[PDB]
Amino acid sequence: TPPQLDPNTPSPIFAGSTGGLLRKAQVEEFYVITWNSPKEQIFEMPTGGAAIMREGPNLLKLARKEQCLALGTRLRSKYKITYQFYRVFPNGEVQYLHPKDGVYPEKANPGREGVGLNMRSIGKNVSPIEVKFTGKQSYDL
Amino acid sequence: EVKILVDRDPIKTSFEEWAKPGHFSRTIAKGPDTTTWIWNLHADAHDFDSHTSDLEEISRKVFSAHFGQLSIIFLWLSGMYFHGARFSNYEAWLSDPTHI
Amino acid sequence: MRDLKTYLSVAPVLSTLWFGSLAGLLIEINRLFPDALTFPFF
Amino acid sequence: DISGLTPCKDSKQFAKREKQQIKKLESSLKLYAPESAPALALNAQIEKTKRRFDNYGKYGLLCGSDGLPHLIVNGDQRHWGEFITPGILFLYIAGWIGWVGRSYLIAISGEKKPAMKEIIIDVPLASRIIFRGFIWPVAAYREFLNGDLIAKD
Amino acid sequence: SHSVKIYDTCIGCTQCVRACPTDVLEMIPWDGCKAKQIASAPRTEDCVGCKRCESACPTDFLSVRVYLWHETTRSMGLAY
Amino acid sequence: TFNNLPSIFVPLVGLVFPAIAMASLFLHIQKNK
Amino acid sequence: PPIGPKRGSKVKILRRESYWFKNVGSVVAVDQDPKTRYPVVVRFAKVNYANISTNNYALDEVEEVAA
Amino acid sequence: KYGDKSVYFDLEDLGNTTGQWDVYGSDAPSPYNPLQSKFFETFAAPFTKRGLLLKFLILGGGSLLTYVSANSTGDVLPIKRGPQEPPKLGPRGKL
Ligand code: CLA
Ligand code: CLA
Ligand code: CLA
Ligand code: CLA
Ligand code: CLA
Ligand SMILES: CC1=C(/C=C/C(C)=C/C=C/C(C)=C\C=C\C=C(C)\C=C\C=C(C)\C=C\C2=C(C)CCCC2(C)C)C(C)(C)CCC1
Ligand code: SF4
Numbered sequence: 001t002p003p004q005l006d007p008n009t010p011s012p013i014f015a016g017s018t019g020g021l022l023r024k025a026q027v028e029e030f031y032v033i034t035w036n037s038p039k040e041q042i043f044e045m046p047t048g049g050a051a052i053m054r055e056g057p058n059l060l061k062l063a064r065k066e067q068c069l070a071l072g073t074r075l076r077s078k079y080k081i082t083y084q085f086y087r088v089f090p091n092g093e094v095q096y097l098h099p100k101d102g103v104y105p106e107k108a109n110p111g112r113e114g115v116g117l118n119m120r121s122i123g124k125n126v127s128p129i130e131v132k133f134t135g136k137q138s139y140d141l
Numbered sequence: 142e143v144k145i146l147v148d149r150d151p152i153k154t155s156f157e158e159w160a161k162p163g164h165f166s167r168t169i170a171k172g173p174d175t176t177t178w179i180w181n182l183h184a185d186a187h188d189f190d191s192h193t194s195d196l197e198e199i200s201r202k203v204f205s206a207h208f209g210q211l212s213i214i215f216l217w218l219s220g221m222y223f224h225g226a227r228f229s230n231y232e233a234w235l236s237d238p239t240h241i
Numbered sequence: 242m243r244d245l246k247t248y249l250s251v252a253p254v255l256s257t258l259w260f261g262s263l264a265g266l267l268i269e270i271n272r273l274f275p276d277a278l279t280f281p282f283f
Numbered sequence: 284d285i286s287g288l289t290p291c292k293d294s295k296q297f298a299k300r301e302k303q304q305i306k307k308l309e310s311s312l313k314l315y316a317p318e319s320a321p322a323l324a325l326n327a328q329i330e331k332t333k334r335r336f337d338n339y340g341k342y343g344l345l346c347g348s349d350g351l352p353h354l355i356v357n358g359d360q361r362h363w364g365e366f367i368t369p370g371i372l373f374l375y376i377a378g379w380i381g382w383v384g385r386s387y388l389i390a391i392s393g394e395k396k397p398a399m400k401e402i403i404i405d406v407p408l409a410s411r412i413i414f415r416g417f418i419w420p421v422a423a424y425r426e427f428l429n430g431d432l433i434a435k436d
Numbered sequence: 437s438h439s440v441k442i443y444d445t446c447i448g449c450t451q452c453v454r455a456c457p458t459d460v461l462e463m464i465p466w467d468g469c470k471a472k473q474i475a476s477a478p479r480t481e482d483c484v485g486c487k488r489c490e491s492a493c494p495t496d497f498l499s500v501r502v503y504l505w506h507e508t509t510r511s512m513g514l515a516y
Numbered sequence: 517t518f519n520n521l522p523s524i525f526v527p528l529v530g531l532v533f534p535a536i537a538m539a540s541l542f543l544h545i546q547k548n549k
Numbered sequence: 550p551p552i553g554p555k556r557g558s559k560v561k562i563l564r565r566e567s568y569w570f571k572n573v574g575s576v577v578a579v580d581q582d583p584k585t586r587y588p589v590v591v592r593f594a595k596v597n598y599a600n601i602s603t604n605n606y607a608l609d610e611v612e613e614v615a616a
Numbered sequence: 617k618y619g620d621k622s623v624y625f626d627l628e629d630l631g632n633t634t635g636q637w638d639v640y641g642s643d644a645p646s647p648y649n650p651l652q653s654k655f656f657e658t659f660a661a662p663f664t665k666r667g668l669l670l671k672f673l674i675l676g677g678g679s680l681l682t683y684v685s686a687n688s689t690g691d692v693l694p695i696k697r698g699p700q701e702p703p704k705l706g707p708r709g710k711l
Contacts, residue, residue: 105462116477123566
């Protein structure tokens with residue numbers, strides 16, 4: 001699927017907190033989540049406090065992926081809205097992150113490939129003596 | 142206005158719930174799969190906000206629990222006054238409350 | 242009494258009854274045979 | 284006289300310990316009226332002390348230079364009553380308990396949910412099983428010979 | 437960063453993905469179980485290491501398996 | 517001057533050498549080739 | 550022909566990495582697909598550390614007990 | 617547009633979104649008198665070179681420290697005085 005192309009949409013009504021983007025946004029990547037709220041309502045944002053998300057499109061810039069996905073799961077489970085967040089490096093190159101196929105990762109969409117997948121039971125891994133003095137570990141054959 | 146607002150016989154007095162242990166919740170009112178069941182039984186024993194998710198039943202539980210605590214404090218006071226009655230030197234202390 | 246014998250069958254009630262009886266037994270033995278350090282009865 | 288220990292009926296330090304404790308009790312006995320109840324309890328404790336020391340005298344206890352009954356647990360018959368005659372009396376009683384609680388666990392092993400009899404003890408079944416462990420040593424012996432003592436996995 | 441390798445004992449219950457707070461895991465189609473799906477792990481670089489995936493894996497020992505490894509700022513749970 | 521030698525070396529090993537080692541190892545800690 | 554044990558056959562486990570290693574279990578169901586790697590669903594009397602009483606096992610990670 | 621109503625993600629102006637503001641950095645010109653400034657710029661230039669300042673501070677601080685400790689009489693610090701008392705015998709004669 002094509003990504004959703006993060007626009008300059010508005011943000012929630014928040015009075016400011018001490019949970020924002022300190023330096024991991026200035027020099028490293030920071031994150032941004034966008035959700036379409038059917039109505040204006042209050043929600044507990046993951047950086048501490050309580051914001052009021054607006055009707056229609058909302059946009060909230062967060063410091064790490066766990067904040068974004070925690071807020072997204074609370075949105076999808078409590079307000080039942082469809083979230084999708086990105087990762088914006090300090091030079092640009094906004095990376096589409098969460099669904100990665102349009103459908104949520106709990107659904108087995110075709111096309112996504114098997115990466116990080118061993119075709120063996122967990123106790124058939126060789127011992128560390130087999131992979132000693134080799135850059136590989138006991139779980140990468 | 143502030144009415145009385147009570148109800149009659151919400152819970153049946155019986156030893157049926159004395160028999161089955163850990164009756165007060167969903168994951169403990171099945172029986173011990175392990176020995177963690179007993180520690181989670183005693184741990185969640187007075188966690189009334191976990192048993193029933195309404196303030197009515199919670200409030201009744203803590204009210205009667207406060208009554209049990211008051212019964213215990215009165216029993217402890219009875220014990221102290223009684224041990225001061227029959228198992229004490231209170232008269233000898235009154236006679237000389239500096240060397241007794 | 243039904244379901245009271247099941248409660249009294251429970252591990253702590255049964256343990257306190259057993260250990261109260263047992264402790265009274267040991268206590269009365271130590272009253273009867275105080276200060277014991279040998280078994281001289283053979 | 285083993286291990287360089289005089290017997291306690293002959294040890295002067297043992298009698299000195301007796302006299303010291305008796306004087307320590309009598310010095311607490313003077314503060315009370317001779318007919319009063321604390322005084323009678325102290326006198327009962329005094330006779331208890333005296334007959335305790337007499338009994339440690341007559342039962343072959345050995346006293347060291349410190350003057351305290353030492354236990355000779357090696358195996359000398361003169362002192363079996365210090366360790367072995369109690370010790371067997373332990374291993375009996377202890378082996379009663381384990382032979383009971385094991386047997387109970389085998390009797391409630393074939394239930395549907397056998398864990399609700401661990402926390403709620405079947406008093407009839409437990410009372411039937413408790414006296415099975417009276418003569419437990421022959422049951423454990425035979426179960427060792429019959430192989431029923433060790434599970435075969 | 438970390439190394440979230442999964443094994444073929446997975447039954448396709450979709451509980452590790454539903455526990456994952458960083459979208460490391462995602463169910464893919466597969467033919468090795470009754471549910472006909474298995475839980476891949478593309479976004480291992482986003483793994484914090486919380487092992488909620490394997491505190492929700494209902495196998496005899498485990499199918500999803502987190503091996504802690506080189507810790508980056510994404511894997512050290514750092515908002516700064 | 518041999519009772520004065522402790523006064524030379526105890527600072528030079530205990531104050532000066534630790535400053536030298538701490539500075540040098542802090543530079544080695546933060547170096548990037 | 551139905552492969553593996555039966556839907557009530559007693560079985561023991563030869564899987565080294567399992568909680569119920571050298572412990573007997575009851576075969577709930579065997580998936581007859583010859584593409585599932587672990588078809589033998591076993592039910593055990595006692596839970597593992599994850600409070601789970603069942604897991605799918607392979608055919609060679611299992612042994613039909615003679616009791 | 618960072619200056620829109622509740623828009624804080626202008627992607628080309630990523631310094632305002634990341635928080636790259638100089639919260640107190642004043643670009644106001646030199647406040648000192650230029651002659652005082654020239655004096656300090658000429659008299660402190662020898663300390664500007666950092667590889668020659670680290671070496672200088674090391675070999676000057678260590679020198680001053682090993683010197684002022686050496687020529688410290690027995691009035692500043694008492695360790696260089698001595699016992700100044702008859703030494704008392706230890707337990708058990710001296711052992
Ligand atoms: C008015 C006083 C009061 C009240 C009504 C409560 C009520 C409650 N507390 Mg709170 N609490 C209190 C005081 C109080 N607490 C104090 C003073 C402390 C500081 C220590 C705490 C710390 C505390 C924590 C940290 C937690 C609670 C929790 C709870 C809940 C469940 C407790 C439970 O089921 O344990 C039932 C009772 C027991 C398990 C027995 C405890 C045994 C004690 C600790 C041993 C000490 C006894 C004795 C002094 C030692 C000698 C014993 C002898 C036999 C050898 C319940 C809502 C829990 C909760 O809500 O979590 C969801 C929880 O996690 N309480
Ligand atoms: C003026 C009347 C009055 C008095 C004296 C009290 C006194 C008390 N209340 Mg309160 N209460 C009142 C009115 C009153 N209440 C009203 C109107 C309400 C409804 C809004 C409540 C709701 C309330 C709650 C929800 C709780 C209490 C609790 C308590 C007890 C706290 C423990 C304490 O301090 O121990 C000091 C101990 C004593 C003074 C010994 C008490 C002995 C006498 C017999 C009882 C006091 C009179 C009482 C109201 C009963 C009247 C007669 C009755 C037959 C109707 C205390 C006894 C708490 C408690 O402990 O739970 C039991 C508790 O959880 N009360
Ligand atoms: C003998 C009379 C009787 C009977 C048959 C019942 C029966 C019942 N009660 Mg009621 N109850 C009673 C008296 C009685 N209650 C009294 C006198 C009080 C006031 C305290 C209550 C307060 C009360 C509340 C608040 C609740 C119940 C509940 C229940 C049910 C569950 C019982 C259970 O599993 O707990 C059995 C528990 C015990 C036997 C423990 C006894 C604890 C006592 C009170 C304190 C002892 C503490 C001790 C001194 C300190 C520890 C010392 C130790 C370390 C040595 C059951 C229908 C529950 C219910 O139905 O809700 C779902 C509930 O929430 N009861
Ligand atoms: C594990 C270490 C240890 C050991 C070996 C002992 C050993 C002893 N202690 Mg010490 N003690 C210990 C730990 C220990 N204690 C601890 C931890 C404490 C603090 C809690 C104490 C506190 C303590 C005190 C305060 C006292 C002792 C006393 C004693 C003596 C017990 C006399 C007695 O009453 O038994 C007599 C025998 C029994 C009670 C067993 C009877 C069992 C029943 C009746 C069944 C037997 C018959 C059976 C049916 C088989 C018959 C055969 C056939 C016909 C069927 C004994 C020398 C007492 C003593 O005399 O001091 C020396 C004493 O006053 N101990
Ligand atoms: C005051 C007296 C006293 C007290 C209170 C205890 C208390 C205890 N003893 Mg000790 N003991 C004592 C005197 C005492 N002992 C004396 C005089 C002897 C010499 C015979 C022993 C020898 C002894 C052994 C050899 C062992 C204990 C053990 C124990 C514990 C569990 C016992 C039990 O019945 O559990 C309930 C009963 C069971 C769980 C099963 C019983 C298993 C024991 C080993 C007896 C089995 C008998 C059998 C013939 C095999 C003998 C093996 C042995 C030679 C190694 C407990 C702390 C056991 C322990 O601490 O384990 C770490 C243990 O192994 N005791
Ligand atoms: C005599 C004596 C002595 C010594 C001794 C010895 C040295 C011994 C050894 C011994 C040994 C070397 C032993 C071994 C054993 C082993 C085994 C292997 C066993 C087993 C057992 C069992 C198994 C049992 C069980 C049971 C019972 C029966 C009861 C309870 C329950 C139960 C089940 C637990 C001394 C000197 C001290 C002193 C003197 C006396
Ligand atoms: S690893 Fe866990 S969550 Fe993933 S398919 Fe297997 S059982 Fe389901």
